[PDB]
Design a protein around this ligand. Structure first.
Ligand SMILES: [K+]
Ligand SMILES: [K+]
Ligand SMILES: [K+]
Ligand SMILES: [K+]
Ligand SMILES: [K+]
Ligand SMILES: [Mg+2]
Ligand SMILES: [Mg+2]
Ligand SMILES: [Mg+2]
Ligand SMILES: [Mg+2]
Ligand SMILES: [Mg+2]
Ligand SMILES: [Mg+2]
Ligand SMILES: [Mg+2]
Ligand SMILES: [Mg+2]
Ligand SMILES: [Mg+2]
Ligand SMILES: [Mg+2]
Ligand SMILES: [Mg+2]
Ligand SMILES: [Mg+2]
Ligand SMILES: [Mg+2]
Ligand SMILES: [Mg+2]
Ligand SMILES: [Mg+2]
Ligand SMILES: [Mg+2]
Ligand SMILES: [Mg+2]
Ligand SMILES: [Mg+2]
Lengths: 88, 117, 124, 64, 88, 134, 372, 35, 96
RNA sequence: AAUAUUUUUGU
RNA sequence: AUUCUGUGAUACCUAGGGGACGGGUAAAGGCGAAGGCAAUCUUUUAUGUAAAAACUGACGUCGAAGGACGAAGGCAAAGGGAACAAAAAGGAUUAGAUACCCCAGUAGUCUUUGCAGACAAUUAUGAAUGCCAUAGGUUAGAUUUUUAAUUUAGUCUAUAAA
């Protein structure tokens, strides 16, 4: 600011303020949702030990297929009920 | 080639901004360049406090300069800026893809609009 | 006027609670071991709950529930104490200091690349 | 930019011919204070454009 | 963003747990009792209203099991049509 | 005045359950008022088309814009996935690179939005300050 | 030359199905919902019917017979076929009453569609030989372009910056040669004017000097130039120096084929009371109360703004079935995007009570019992 | 008339969920001690 | 003819770059005149010493989409003039 | 969700 | 447990340095002869792909040998040395434990100039040409009645004839 400068640090981006329609408990739920949407807890675990480029690559291929298979499965489950609703 | 330099200097003196913009400006024209525009941005916070030459800075005086000079001039322009202890940091970039059709639509540095390319 | 801070650092094996002033100077810097836990019980959820209650209790003895008008709760790490201490501040133990909270931030340290980490372990 | 002295000069001669200040429709209605002024203003502006375009199209200012 | 993939040929298109797993409600009341003792105390009066709720929970009769979900049957009808086929 | 105030709260509560903004010309049927339609099972407010193609701009040439970069990075400073931006792989690679150029050039933060943008957002007077400590 | 088998298919009924027209235009730079879609502004698929004798069997003239569960029981048999045979080997269909009955409701209001009016009400019909015309000739000048409604060129102010670039480069740039010829035809006519006028008391005009020079004379007057470019590309006029081009031309017919009535200047003769003053009211729902700076109401399936004035002030959960108020539809028009906007105007009191007399809802009947 | 029967069913769903959310708001904070 | 269409498109780019040569700077005389005019201690409404005061913020995505979704309101009149010109400049090539 | 005591042999 | 700490540690800050690393984006994605290549700016370098036109006119494919390139580790010389870590060394586990685990830790990893030429250097499938029926995704383009369908060159699943 004019006299005191803002503390620009990684925690500055991970900050949620208390307002009239957002109490303390409401700021925690907003934080947890944002801390999990950015996969912070996942980064701490992966950065605990080193994963060579080949293991980090093959690990993504395994997790990327399970994500595509799970997505295409929910689409077939909801497509089944969309057809079951038409009487098919 | 169409270049663009975003220089950040100390917020203390406004005269220091003129001498820097003029030194690099005359340098471009003497070599044979064509300055397209020079926007004077004010003094606002930096991405983070960075210390240069045993001096902690929290906000520098920004300024953009879009010129069309040769490679030798560009390197010489951004090399003198770096050596100058009055600049906090610089951001040089090559504008456009190199084609004439796109290089002819670069004018004033926009702030409330985009560079439609 | 920067608010007071209530840093809560917690990892797999211990938890630290530091209460600083606007200038970031520690006032109450305690850990689980300060209560009597020895080498294994500093990780338990219960120990982190007693530490939070002990720290908050010490804040009342120092008359900080009337001296602090604005406070910030900073969280670093995902250990068991991340939820234990929060529930203390979100219960009856921390009802006096709850009204003065204005911010809630996270200060977990991550590296974009950074220094090489230890090799994986083979426990099996 | 895949140009040459011929194409360059043609564009200049064309650009200046389509931007020349159109004179008044009639002579009695013409105003020498404005017509002669635009002639000098446009002429000076043309010299600047030519001097600026010649530097942009200079092949010595290109890359490998 | 890409759309859901067409699942490969599977042996059977089904969901492991068709009907949701019901959580014992009294386990949640016990957690509240253990919370009072942690903060208030064991031989206190603040846990009175909470301890009584724990006794009333274990006394009440458990609900009846819900009718099983027929999702897996409809998934088996549209498997060969939704996926690439059946494999065995 | 008590009944008047309590009625307002209960009224606004129901207004929150009508997850639909009726517009002029929108055709509605008796089914468009049932819970299934109002429940809003859709959990995604995704974009329609590639904004970089509708606005016809080159991201790489607009690295100066500090608001354009803060719009394509999460509050944590992480580039947004194509699911959120809803861009094509080519345009996503252009915006992803424009963010790295600006951050790499040192003109934009890498872990949060630009400070000057944090001054205009909520919590203006509650931003973390730096005490001189001396 | 077509075989007899190929000649019957051409005239068959299933081959007459119209292609699925694009959905009603929406904001390109906006967010929408993917896993859920509500009713559209106007229909995009053809609504089908079948004989009551064929409905008991599921035969709708499609690839396969439809199921009887979701197809029988309703009064009006309507269905929309999104795909006659999908990758699941099933006719992807859905009930079409969402738009089939909405047309019957609107047509029950007995109101025509009139051209939009800027704010002396002048309700002019849409189907008229002067305005409703799509064919034209190169002789009609700008003064007649205000009548047309179907233009070949796009609305510049509506197109996005990217859609405008594609137009300039791939539709406008490769037309200079043909446009220069367009000027020559005009210059050829100008030279004939003086010749004709002088004879009472054409030249080929192929010369690049006149064309190139003719354009240099219009640089000072850019207005007359735009009128010439628009005529070559068939653009919708934007600047007044008029045809309600503020929001742009319509993406369809001004009526959208929903109501073909031309005038509302009639008086329904009531049996007992006689010719009434205004048209019978219509009950309307109350959606999105003010406490949004405007209230929405559902009039015959459509959503329109409430009358310029309770039920509109605050929400009332106690009111069973929701707040419903009687109202009169004053004017109806189709905007550029294709929406059907209604100018719902508050209704009178006597009309409502009169409309209920034939229903049995009026508390005190107006006939006989009414002493004054 | 059909909209009434559907609007009523929505009202039942709204009041049920609204009341349900109140429990979530009160369950966030802890008051089991009954101070 | 195909080689003429390319040269023609190459010419238009030079005429465009010719019209934008009014704001360029070719000699030191225009340089010092430009610096002394824009670089002053009281140029950004001073109060405030930042471009974030006169022009509060740079155009964002929210604002951009609002120009084509929110409003569509009088910016069309200022935009149409700039668009109609671009259409005429393309066909006629006059670069008005 | 990121948890991990030990446990050999068989003409 | 060895170990760190009252010579004030951990925790929370301030101000100066110092090295190597590369978060998100990120995908069945892409690029090169392979090996292999993922922060960023400027400079620099050879192929390849799409669309049309124009040009040369069989100038093509494979290719022993020679030569060039060739991962990590390693040798040689001079730098650098935060982190990780063969070796050496200690603490535990265990019937025993060089081991797996732990406290610390040198070469080495990085830079520059050479040597070295072995790899599950893999698609366990040499390179190349002609040819054989479909479908569902996906990558970079092209065309269009750019809504959505054709189409060129790749890549990946599931099939027909075989
Ligand atoms: K110290
Ligand atoms: K390739
Ligand atoms: K170590
Ligand atoms: K060698
Ligand atoms: K394919
Ligand atoms: Mg301690
Ligand atoms: Mg180790
Ligand atoms: Mg073991
Ligand atoms: Mg044996
Ligand atoms: Mg460094
Ligand atoms: Mg490889
Ligand atoms: Mg990465
Ligand atoms: Mg060969
Ligand atoms: Mg060989
Ligand atoms: Mg080596
Ligand atoms: Mg080496
Ligand atoms: Mg050595
Ligand atoms: Mg040992
Ligand atoms: Mg190396
Ligand atoms: Mg290898
Ligand atoms: Mg070979
Ligand atoms: Mg691939
Ligand atoms: Mg296969």
């Amino acid at each position: 600011q004019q006299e005191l400068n803002i503390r620009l640090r990684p925690s500055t981006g991970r900050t949620f303020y208390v307002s009239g329609h957002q109490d303390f408990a409401g700021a925690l739920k907003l934080l947890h949702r944002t801390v999990a949407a950015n996969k912070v807890k996942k980064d701490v675990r992966l950065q605990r030990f080193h994963e060579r480029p080949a293991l980090k690559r093959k690990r993504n291929l395994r997790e990327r297929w399970r994500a595509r298979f799970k997505e295409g499965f929910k689409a077939a489950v909801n497509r089944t009920f969309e057809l079951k609703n038409q009487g098919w | 080639m169409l270049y663009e330099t975003i220089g950040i200097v100390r917020p203390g003196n406004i005269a220091e901004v003129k001498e820097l913009v003029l030194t690099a400006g005359k340098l471009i024209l003497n070599q044979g360049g064509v300055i397209r525009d020079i926007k004077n941005w004010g003094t606002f916070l930096l991405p983070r406090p960075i210390s240069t030459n045993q001096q902690r800075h929290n906000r520098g005086h920004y300024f953009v300069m879009r010129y069309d000079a040769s490679i030798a001039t560009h390197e010489e322009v951004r090399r003198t800026m770096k050596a100058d202890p009055r600049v906090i940091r610089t951001a040089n970039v090559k504008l456009g893809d190199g084609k004439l059709e796109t290089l002819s639509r670069f004018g004033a540095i926009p702030w409330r609009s985009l560079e439609e390319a | 006027d920067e608010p007071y801070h209530f840093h809560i650092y917690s990892h797999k094996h211990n938890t630290h609670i530091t209460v600083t002033k606007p200038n970031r100077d520690a006032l109450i810097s305690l850990s689980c071991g300060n209560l009597g836990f020895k080498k294994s019980n500093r990780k338990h959820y219960d120990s982190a709950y007693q530490l939070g209650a002990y720290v908050v209790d010490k804040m009342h003895q120092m008359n900080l529930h009337n001296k602090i008008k604005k406070m910030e709760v900073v969280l670093r790490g995902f250990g068991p104490g991340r939820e234990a201490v929060i529930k203390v501040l979100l219960g009856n133990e921390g009802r006096m200091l709850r009204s003065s909270i204005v911010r809630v931030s996270d200060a977990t340290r991550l590296k974009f690349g950074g220094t090489r980490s230890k090799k994986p372990r083979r426990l099996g | 930019y895949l140009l040459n002295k011929d194409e360059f000069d043609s564009a200049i001669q064309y650009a200046e011919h389509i931007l020349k200040p159109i004179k008044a429709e009639d002579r009695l209605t013409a105003d020498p204070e404005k017509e002669d002024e635009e002639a000098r203003e446009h002429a000076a502006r043309h010299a600047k454009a030519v001097a600026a375009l010649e530097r942009i199209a200079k092949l010595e200012h290109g890359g490998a | 963003p890409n759309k859901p993939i067409r699942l490969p040929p599977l042996k059977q298109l089904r969901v492991r747990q068709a009907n949701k797993a019901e959580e014992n409600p009294c386990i949640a009341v016990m957690s509240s009792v253990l919370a009072c003792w942690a903060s208030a105390g064991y031989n206190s009066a603040g846990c009175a209203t909470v301890e009584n709720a724990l006794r009333a929970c274990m006394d009440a009769p458990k609900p009846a099991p819900k009718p099983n979900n027929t999702i897996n049957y409809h998934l088996s009808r549209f498997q060969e049509r939704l996926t690439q086929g059946k494999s065995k | 005045v008590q009944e008047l105030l309590q009625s307002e709260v209960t009224s606004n509560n129901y207004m929150r359950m009508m997850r639909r903004r009726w517009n002029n010309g929108d055709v509605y049927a008796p089914r468009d008022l049932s819970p299934y339609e109002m429940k809003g099972r859709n959990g995604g407010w995704v974009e329609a088309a590639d904004v970089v193609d509708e606005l016809g701009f080159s991201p790489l040439d607009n690295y100066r814009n500090f608001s354009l970069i803060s719009d394509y990075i999460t509050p944590f400073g992480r580039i947004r996935h194509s699911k959120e931006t809803g861009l094509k792989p080519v345009n996503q690679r252009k915006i992803a690179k424009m963010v790295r150029r600006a951050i790499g050039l040192g003109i934009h933060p890498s872990v949060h939005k630009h400070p000057e943008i944090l001054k205009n957002s909520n919590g203006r007077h509650l931003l973390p300050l730096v005490v001189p400590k001396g | 030359g077509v075989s007899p088998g190929g000649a019957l298919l051409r005239t068959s009924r299933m081959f007459s199905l119209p292609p699925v027209i694009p959905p009603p235009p929406g904001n390109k730079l906006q967010m929408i919902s993917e896993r859920a879609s509500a009713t559209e502004a106007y229909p995009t698929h053809q609504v089908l019917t079948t004989f009551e004798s064929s409905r008991s069997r599921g035969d709708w003239g499609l690839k396969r017979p439809l199921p009887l569960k979701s197809t029988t029981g309703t009064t009006y048999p309507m269905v929309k076929v999104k795909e006659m045979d999908s990758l699941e080997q099933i006719t992807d269909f859905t009930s079409g009453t969402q738009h089939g009955l909405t047309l019957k409701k609107f047509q029950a209001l007995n109101i025509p569609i009139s051209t939009p009016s800027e704010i002396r009400p002048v309700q002019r019909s849409v189907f008229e030989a002067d305005t409703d015309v799509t064919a034209f000739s190169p002789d009609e000048q700008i003064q007649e372009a205000e009548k047309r409604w179907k233009f070949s060129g796009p609305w510049l102010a509506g197109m996005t910056p990217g859609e405008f670039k594609e137009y300039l480069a791939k539709t406008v740039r490769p037309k200079r040669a043909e446009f220069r010829k367009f000027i020559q035809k005009k210059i050829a006519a100008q030279k004939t004017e003086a010749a004709n006028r002088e004879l009472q008391e054409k030249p080929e005009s192929i010369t690049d000097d006149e064309v190139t020079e003719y354009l240099r004379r219009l640089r000072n007057d850019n207005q007359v130039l735009y009128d010439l470019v628009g005529q070559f590309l068939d653009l919708a006029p934007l600047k007044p120096p008029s045809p309600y081009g503020g929001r742009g031309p319509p993406i369809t017919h001004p009526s959208a084929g929903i109501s073909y009535l031309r005038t509302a200047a009639y008086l329904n003769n009531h049996p007992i009371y006689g010719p009434q003053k205004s048209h019978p009211p219509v009950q309307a729902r109350v959606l999105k109360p003010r406490r949004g700076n405007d209230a929405k109401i559902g009039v015959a399936g459509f959503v329109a703004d409430g009358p310029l004035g309770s039920v509109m002030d605050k929400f009332d959960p106690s009111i069973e079935g929701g707040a419903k108020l009687w109202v009169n539809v004053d004017k109806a028009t189709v905007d550029s995007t294709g929406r059907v906007q209604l100018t719902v105007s508050d209704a009178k009191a006597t009309d409502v009570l009169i409309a209920k007399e034939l229903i049995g809802d009026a508390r005190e009947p107006i006939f006989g019992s009414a002493p004054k | 008339e059909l909209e009434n029967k559907t609007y009523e069913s929505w009202k039942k769903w709204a009041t049920t969920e609204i009341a349900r959310q109140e429990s979530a708001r009160a369950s966030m904070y802890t008051n089991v001690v009954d101070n | 003819e195909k080689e003429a269409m390319k040269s023609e498109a190459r010419r238009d780019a030079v005429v465009q770059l010719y019209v934008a040569s009014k704001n360029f700077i070719v000699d030191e005389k225009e340089l010092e005149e430009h610096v002394n005019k824009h670089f002053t201690e009281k140029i950004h409404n001073a109060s405030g010493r930042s471009i974030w005061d006169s022009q509060k913020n740079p155009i964002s995505m929210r604002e951009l989409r609002n120009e084509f979704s929110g409003f569509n309101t009088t910016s069309a009149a200022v935009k149409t003039t700039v668009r109609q010109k671009n259409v005429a400049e393309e066909l006629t090539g006059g670069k008005l």
